[PDB]
């Protein structure tokens, strides 16, 4: 009673919703459930790309230090992505998660110094604040408005211990001198799956508005805003954890009945 | 072939925030596995109203037949069924007794919530499910919910003096909040543990006591594991990302 079209729509959906670090396992599962490699190839190739861009997959480019994020902002069409720091495009294989064919590329000579200044400040912030963080900063004119888009990824994959986690944050500064509108979104996903499946999914929207001046000084100011908000979010998450544990969890079920002993099952039954 | 194994692996990985939709989608992806999936994939418990006795009871695959569910209070299906699976007279008597017993267990440990017990016959004994559902009151703008699903298989012997018990217990724990500091936070999912034991069956140690002790031991253990995993391990993982 279910058509192939419906089955592959479901396959594509599950692939896009794989937890951090578990794309291969989910893909293998879905591949064997569909049992139709052709259907999967046709009806689900968009999903591999959507996963990598949604997840800000960092990727190492042979010849260049550090990594670049795969994001919607880097998507150049035709399987290529932009690396705005190294000023190159490259082919990206969404299935093997492999970059190749780096070629020099042009972007925006106007937003050039601002992007570089923000990138320089952001890279230092990310190396200082994240154990293995990576960032990518783009500079484009959107609806006529000069925009700096800063993307930050950091993950820890430990599948032998049955857990994985990933932080993503994306910060957009729309420059409207003497101010800039800041919009951002911070996201966390954590998955623990030893004898179960527990996940944290969290996200926070940020709206702010700050003074803009020169490129280097504005970059410093932008990084302080990012720092303050990301610290506050991480602090608030740990507070929520404390409250959930000492309030909500405790109210859901006692450790023991008021007698401070386990039940007498014979006295229950009579 | 490997299909069921892959379907269950998927459920361990897809976000439990979409647990109900995940199962519905999986059954559409592999329709021929429907019975096995309904049987093997736990879902949040639903509360229904028994309009005959006026008591709440819990819905899951174990008390379902077609689109109807059997109440442990009135022993009837809703919507009514001509030919719904019913326990034997002997098992129904044990079921009533279990329901009363686990209702006191529920009050003692949960101080609220809803419980239900459903038994069914096996060739050489019987099986049961003990269900508990408790919603938090919503204090400090945190939504909370606990589901216990304890499935026990009892193999009875010709002598009637010993039985083998195997308990497979899932607990699902759901927490959600939306605050200015944290934004939306949803911490949810489930853990499953199993254990197995021969026990004396006697007048001093009857089936309900044997099962009750194992259920209590298991749920106490899972409560402490949940505490460790939710509020210890996931939090440490978060702080390890930044």
């Amino acid at each position: 009673r279910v058509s192939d079209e419906e089955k592959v729509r479901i396959a594509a959906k599950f692939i896009t919703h794989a937890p951090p670090g578990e794309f291969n396992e989910v893909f293998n599962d879905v591949r064997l459930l569909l049992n139709n490699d052709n259907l999967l190839r046709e009806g689900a190739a968009h999903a591999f790309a959507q996963y990598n861009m949604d997840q800000f997959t960092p990727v190492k480019i042979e010849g260049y230090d550090d990594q670049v994020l795969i994001t919607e902002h880097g998507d150049l069409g035709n399987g290529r992505f932009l690396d705005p720091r190294n000023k190159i495009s490259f082919k990206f294989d969404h299935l093997r998660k492999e970059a190749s064919d780096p070629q020099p590329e042009d972007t925006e000579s106007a937003l050039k110094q601002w992007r570089d200044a923000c990138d320089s400040a952001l890279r230092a912030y990310v190396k200082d604040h994240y154990p293995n963080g990576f960032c990518t900063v783009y500079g484009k004119s959107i609806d006529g408005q000069q925009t700096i888009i800063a993307c930050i990824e950091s993950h820890q994959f430990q599948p032998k211990n049955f857990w994985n986690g990933r932080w993503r944050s994306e910060w957009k500064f729309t420059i409207t001198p003497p101010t800039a509108q800041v919009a951002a979104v911070l996201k966390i996903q954590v998955h623990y799956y030893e004898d179960g499946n527990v996940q944290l999914v969290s996200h926070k929207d940020i709206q702010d508005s700050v003074q803009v001046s020169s490129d280097v000084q504005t970059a410093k100011e932008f990084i302080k805003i990012i720092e303050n908000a990301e610290n506050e979010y991480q602090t608030a998450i740990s507070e929520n954890y404390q409250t959930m544990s000492d309030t909500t969890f405790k109210a859901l079920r006692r450790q023991l009945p008021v007698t401070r002993t386990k039940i007498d099952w014979n006295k229950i039954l009579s | 072939d490997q299909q069921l194994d892959c379907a269950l692996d998927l459920m361990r990985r897809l976000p439990p925030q979409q647990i109900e939709k995940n199962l519905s989608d999986l059954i559409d992806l592999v329709p021929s596995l429907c019975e096995d999936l309904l049987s093997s994939v736990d879902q949040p418990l639903k509360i229904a109203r028994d309009k005959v006795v006026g008591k709440d009871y819990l819905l899951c695959d174990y008390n379902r037949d077609g689109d109807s569910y059997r109440s442990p209070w009135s022993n009837k299906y809703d919507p009514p069924l001509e030919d719904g699976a019913m326990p034997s007279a002997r098992l129904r008597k044990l079921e009533v007794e279990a329901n009363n017993a686990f209702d006191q267990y529920r009050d003692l440990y949960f101080e609220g919530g809803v419980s239900s017990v459903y038994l069914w016959d096996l060739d050489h004994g019987f099986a049961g499910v003990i269900l508990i559902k408790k919603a938090g009151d919503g204090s400090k703008k945190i939504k909370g919910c606990w589901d216990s699903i304890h499935v026990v298989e009892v193999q009875e012997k010709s002598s009637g003096r010993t039985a083998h018990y195997k308990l497979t217990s899932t607990v699902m724990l759901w927490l959600q909040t939306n605050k200015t500091g944290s934004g939306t936070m949803n911490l949810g999912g489930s853990l499953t543990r199993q254990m197995e034991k021969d026990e004396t069956v006697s007048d001093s140690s009857p089936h309900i006591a044997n099962i009750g002790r194992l259920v209590e031991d298991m749920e106490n253990k899972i409560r402490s594991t949940l505490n460790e995993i939710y509020f210890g391990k996931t939090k440490d993982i978060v702080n390890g990302l930044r």
Binding site: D195 | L8, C34, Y62, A85, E153, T168, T192
Partner: peptide, 23 residues
């Protein structure tokens, strides 16, 4: 290669499927 405890719980055969799935 995950262990699936819920796959080997006792069953009740003879259960009719929900109508939308036929059986």
């Amino acid at each position: 290669n995950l262990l699936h405890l819920t796959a080997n719980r006792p069953k009740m055969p003879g259960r009719r499927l929900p109508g939308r799935f036929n059986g």
